[PDB]
Nucleic acid binder design. Structure first.
Ligand SMILES: [Mn+2]
Ligand SMILES: [Mn+2]
Ligand SMILES: [Mn+2]
Length: 425
DNA sequence: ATTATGACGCT
């Protein structure tokens, strides 16, 4: 009882830009704002592949990883913005730069861990403590939480419900106890309101957020109320939330491991996990997964918010599907050069912005008819930021995959170059 | 013929 630690030591937030690429294009092109619109890559094959969808377009059924011609069938007024094309491939520079704008604002409040181009985690523990002392006993007004939902409330129109739940939460709050996890989460959500207001003020981009005691709960919370809303998931709300939460909705259980949790244990929802001992879980899923599952189904996870705002690897990738697969030597060389030229541009920009050089080049290929997504991955040294040298080395390192007797066989359906192992400059 | 990435575990 008194010695069962409840994983309530931390305040952790997950901030996620709503349909991020679409917002970047909507800021640039006002004629897209407040409309069904999506962002695509390429346009010849079925109108191109959609990778981001505005909420108005989502209400028609338009989803990511859908062909544009198909989405137009669901949403005939759909508007489309196209990813930039450079050297024959998609170039995502506009979005990496918008992402960095957002990250630099978030970093003014706390230390953040960039988790993807559009989302980061925040460790607010110190910030909440500082603020809690700044109030010196003053209660938290609902006015300070204008977009916050309290998960599990009310109990016993949408904005009316939100306000009722916030009112129940605040009325039941003990503002005098500077050590109550619920008060701490609450101050964290106030700071997250301020972070999101600064982001919208200074970039125009809207975002959702989750506020909880760890990364998995913060991430799960962020998704409960989108777009443009933030959700507080308290420790106390976990048993009811998890009691109907499909296992697959938890971060890292959406694929094969979650499928086998479901199949092996004979269960559907996160909460059923609590009925197993740690040893049973470890026996089925290994010692690490076992401990992690045993704590997670009770709302507890210790994965830290890493202080890492910049990517650890810088990569360039192009698929060559169907009949576009690269079948000759000249083709493989030209596309390796195009990839290495974009990689060189991004790496030089990186070294100048962030004072660091990569030291290792990773070359990855898929061959046609190969089941795997990486038919080969081989590393070599990266000593100078020169696109010709890097493409020549990537060739030197992949060339023994050709089984021709000028030709290339099996034809290549993917090239990939990744600069890694960064060291300060 | 979702594609372009990027983190992280396993051995
Ligand atoms: Mn997002
Ligand atoms: Mn998405
Ligand atoms: Mn995201």
């Amino acid at each position: 009882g008194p010695h069962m630690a409840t994983g309530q030591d931390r305040v952790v937030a997950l901030v996620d830009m709503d349909c991020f690429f679409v917002q970047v294009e909507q800021r640039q092109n006002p004629h897209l704002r407040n409309k069904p619109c999506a962002v695509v890559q390429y346009k010849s094959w079925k109108g191109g592949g959609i990778i981001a969808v505005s909420y108005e377009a989502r209400a028609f059924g338009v989803t990511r990883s859908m062909w544009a011609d198909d989405a137009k069938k669901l949403c005939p007024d759909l508007l489309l913005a196209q990813v930039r094309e450079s050297r024959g491939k998609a170039n995502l520079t506009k979005y990496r730069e918008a992402s960095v704008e957002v990250m630099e604002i978030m970093s003014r409040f706390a230390v953040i861990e960039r988790a993807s181009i559009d989302e980061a985690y925040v460790d607010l523990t110190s910030a909440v403590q500082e603020r809690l002392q700044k109030l010196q006993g003053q209660p938290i007004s609902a006015d300070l939480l204008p977009s916050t939902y309290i998960e599990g409330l009310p109990q016993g129109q949408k904005e009316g419900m939100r306000k009722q739940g916030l009112f129940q939460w605040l009325d039941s709050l003990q503002i005098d106890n500077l050590t109550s996890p619920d008060l701490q989460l609450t101050v964290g959500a106030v700071i997250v309101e301020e972070m999101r207001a600064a982001i919208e003020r200074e970039t125009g981009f809207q975002c959702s957020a989750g506020i909880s005691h760890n990364k998995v709960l913060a991430k799960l919370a962020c998704g409960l109320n989108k777009p443009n809303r933030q959700t507080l998931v308290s420790h106390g709300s976990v048993p009811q939330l998890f009691s109907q939460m499909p296992i697959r909705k938890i971060r890292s259980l959406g694929g094969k491991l979650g499928a086998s949790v479901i199949e092996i244990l004979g269960i559907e929802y996160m909460g059923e996990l609590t009925q197993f001992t740690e040893s049973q879980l470890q026996s089925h899923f290994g010692e690490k997964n076992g401990s992690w599952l045993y704590a997670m189904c009770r709302g507890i996870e210790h994965d830290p918010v890493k202080p890492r705002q910049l990517p650890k690897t810088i990569g360039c990738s192009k698929n060559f599907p169907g009949k576009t697969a690269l079948a000759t030597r000249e083709q493989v060389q030209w596309w390796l050069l195009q990839l290495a030229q974009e990689l060189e541009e991004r790496l030089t920009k990186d070294r100048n912005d962030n004072d660091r050089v990569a030291t290792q080049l990773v070359v990855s290929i898929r061959v046609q008819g190969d089941k795997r997504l990486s038919s080969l991955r081989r590393c070599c040294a990266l000593t100078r930021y020169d696109a010709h040298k890097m493409s020549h080395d990537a060739f030197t390192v992949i060339k023994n995959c050709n089984t021709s007797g000028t030709e290339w066989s099996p034809p290549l359906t993917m090239l990939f170059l990744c600069a890694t192992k960064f060291s300060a400059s």
